[PDB]
Structure 1
Amino acid sequence: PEMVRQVFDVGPRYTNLSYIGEGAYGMVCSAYDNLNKVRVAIKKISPFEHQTYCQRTLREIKILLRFRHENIIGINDIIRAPTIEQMKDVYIVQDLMETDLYKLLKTQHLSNDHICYFLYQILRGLKYIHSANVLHRDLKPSNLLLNTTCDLKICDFGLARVADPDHDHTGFLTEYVATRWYRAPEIMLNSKGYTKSIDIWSVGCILAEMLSNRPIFPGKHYLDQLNHILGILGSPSQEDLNCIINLKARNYLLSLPHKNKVPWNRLFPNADSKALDLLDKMLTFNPHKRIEVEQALAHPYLEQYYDPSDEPIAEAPFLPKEKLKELIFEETARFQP
């Protein structure tokens, strides 16, 4: 088997490997597809020792095999051993992109036209995801891939879940898995992240980061994340506080000194005014007042791209590790000769 840094056993169809980056449970390589005569991306996954890893791998495979959308990366092939006894790793083959938005923002300033086009494609993909009753729950620059002509695709459904708004309520300061800087304020107050507004907040954070090439809320631990959010949004209104019935969460907010809102055009003096208007509506403190994906697509900032007939929706909306390995084996059987 061909080896990189680690067994990367994808031959003989896929040859001439090059290291790219990292997935959750293994590395990502580029390779030559000898059948299709094009280079592809391959992610190695080794989840079978841990139950939670098998959960993350199975649910992502299930979601991506049903999804078909121009702004969501698809699974072209899945490589694994012919038997459950022999399969230790799984390889996911996907289109080879040029970069991810995290790396791009490290060194490239975006024109307003690029910001607009990137945001349009994120929301177009997100409309499809949400139309399937699915939440991505970990949107961030490193999970957005771009090709050489700036077509954008959403990657990593590792933390995705079916929406469950009737069971979203939780206590104050309960732990959360998704990446800190892109967490909506209600995660730290009273939300399990089971509603679609959790994704819109992350997109708002991504928009702000495209405007300035730096994360807008770079919190350095759990409750510090809320410090950063309130430091820019200012203190929540009485009405928004009244929507927080949990006493521990509400009294925490009531204990804070008053904070003024920082105007978006002071933070982003170069930004298009329409982009800042949409940014404000995505980074709304109250999740029930936060703009939804279809409203965001219809916002004037995105007028040159908006076309609901060309923004498709899903046709079909949505355990011991040994049973999960068996389910992963079964879910990947369609790609076997």
Structure 2
Amino acid sequence: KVYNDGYDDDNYDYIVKNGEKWMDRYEIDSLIGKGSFGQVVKAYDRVEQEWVAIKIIKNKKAFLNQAQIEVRLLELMNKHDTEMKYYIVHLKRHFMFRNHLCLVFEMLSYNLYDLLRNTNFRGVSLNLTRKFAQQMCTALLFLATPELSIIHCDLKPENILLCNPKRSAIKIVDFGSSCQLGQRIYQYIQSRFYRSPEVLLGMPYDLAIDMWSLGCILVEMHTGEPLFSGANEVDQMNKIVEVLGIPPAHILDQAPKARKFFEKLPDGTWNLKKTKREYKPPGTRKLHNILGVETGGPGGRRAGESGHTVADYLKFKDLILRMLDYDPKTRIQPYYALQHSFFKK
């Protein structure tokens, strides 16, 4: 029993062969990525004389149609003149090859999860965290340009890659989960650890959910550890509450899924549901201590390092708390984030 003549496995993926030449142009080197989606390969373009990453989509209607969304959004980004688009991975061209849609991207280096692995999850400096933070704020500003209004819907360290392994330049990848501002379709979105409270509560959402994710990410880059590591949605909300307290009454009064995590007392105020004592009381796990503002950084491991002063840590703390505002209408936006004192030289 064969699939697609030679060419596919029993699972609609193209069977990758090292050394194969496509369309008398692309020399396939190796398999570098897997997903649901299909595969990613490192390949040499003989014509243009450069390495590329090729995203080979499964030969199956559902994934093809998903990738065409990705293509459409990238091509939309492509027609904008500004320099801010460089923080998004660039789609060079696409083509069908043996019944698989193939997206050709510029070749990048490792992602920010791999970078943490090399620190043994002890985190990178605050100077480097800042460089990443500034570039991401700029990328979100670009996505926010009115004619795009794109929500990535899945920011996490895995989906932010270095351009070069010895430099700090980064880009966002994978717009297959994305959408534009408009009428709600999707409700179960964002990777759990990076999932915003408006999504957890079943409420309306907008581009601000990406800023929440960024907040969680930047802390995790410096500590090496995820800020909110929930095993399920209840645990995820409880871990959020440990740091940031009970969310405001006016929000919870409108949440469809309010009662999944909370109960409204006879006097109108909201509490956690009682579900073996486990969590720290509401708002007692202060971000102040997580970052180690006055105690030499996370685990005290930055004591005596330059570029880790108390003054520097306070600016970081402030910016992060603005990204982790419970209210998506007052949560800081990209244009104003870029003006914060954490970026003044």
Same structural fold, with TM-score higher than 0.5 when normalized by the shorter chain: yes
Please tell me whether residue 279 in structure 1 is matched to residue 320 in structure 2: yes
Q: Structure 1's 18 and 280: CA in aligned 2 closer, same or farther, altered over 3 A?
A: same
Whole-Å separation in 2 of the counterparts to 1:283 and 1:261: 16
Q: Secondary structure at the match of 1:76?
A: strand
Contact (CA 8 Å) 2:14, 2:56: kept in 1 or not?
no
Instruction: Tell me what 1:67 maps to.
Output: 77
- Give the Å deviation of 1:127: 0.5
Match of 2:91, SS state, is: coil
Tell me which residue corresponds to 2:175. 157
Q: Please, which moves more after superposition, 104-113 or 131-140?
A: 104-113
Contact 1:21–1:27 (Cα < 8 Å) also in 2: yes
- Label 1:120 to 1:28 Cα distance change in 2 as closer, same or farther (>3 A): same
The answer for the alignment partner of 1:227 in structure 2 is: 238
Of the two, which has the highest radius of gyration? 2
Tell me whether 37-46 or 255-264 shows the greater mean CA deviation. 255-264
Distance 2:31 2:168 in 1: 22
1:102-141 equivalences under 5 Å are 102-108=113-119, 109-131=123-145, 132-141=148-157
Indicate conservation of the 8 Å contact 1:48/1:88, yes or no.
no
Give the structure, 1 or 2, with the largest relative contact order (CA under 8 Å, sep 6 or more).
1
CA contact (8 A) 1:190 1:246 kept: no
- Partner Cα separation in structure 2 for residue 61 and residue 138 of structure 1: 17
Kindly tell me: are residues 175 and 133 of structure 1, through their superposed partners in 2, closer, same or farther at Cα, counting changes over 3 Å? closer
- The sequence identity of aligned pairs, in percent, is 29
Unaligned runs of 5+ in 1: 82-86, 305-337
1:6 to 15, 34, 40: 15
Corresponding residue SS for 1:290:
coil
Instruction: Please give the alpha-carbon distance, in whole angstroms, between the structure 2 residues aligned to 1:283 and 1:121.
Output: 18
Aligned residues: 287
In the alignment, is the contact (CA less than 8 A) between 2:242 and 2:284 conserved in 1? yes
Q: Are 1:33 and 1:39, in contact at CA under 8 Å, matched by a contact in 2?
A: yes
Deviation at 1:248, TM superposition (A): 5.2
Residue in structure 2 matching 1:242, options 221, 244, 250: 250
Q: Please point out which of 29, 36, 58 is paired with 2:68.
A: 58
C-alpha contact 1:241 1:250 (8 A) present in aligned 2: no
Q: C-alpha deviations, 1:110-146, integer Å up to 9, x for none?
A: 1222111111111111110111211111111111111
- CA drift of 1:247 comes to 6.4
- Cα distance change of structure 1 residues 13 and 2 upon mapping to structure 2, 3 Å threshold: farther
Structure 2 gap ranges (5+): 1-5, 79-84, 263-269, 274-280, 298-307
Q: Contact 1:163–1:195 at 8 Å: present in 2 too?
A: yes
Match of 2:111 in 1: 100
Shift of 1:49: 3.1
| Residue number in structure 2 paired with 1:181 | 193
- Cα offset, 1:218, TM superposition: 0.9
Give distance in 1, aligned partners of 2:56 and 2:130: 33
Alignment partner for residue 39 of structure 1, among 31, 44, 51?
Answer: 51
Q: Deviations over 1:30-58 (max 9, x none)?
A: 111111212111111116332xx344212
| One-letter identity of the residue aligned with 2:324 | L
Q: In 1, distance between residues paired with 2:181 and 2:138?
A: 18
Farther-moved stretch of structure 1 (31-40 vs 9-18): 9-18
Output aligned runs, 1:70-85, within 5 Å.
Answer: 70-81=86-97
2:305 alignment partner in structure 1: none
Who is 2:285 aligned against? 262
Question: Matches of 1:183 and 1:127 in 2, distance apart?
Answer: 20
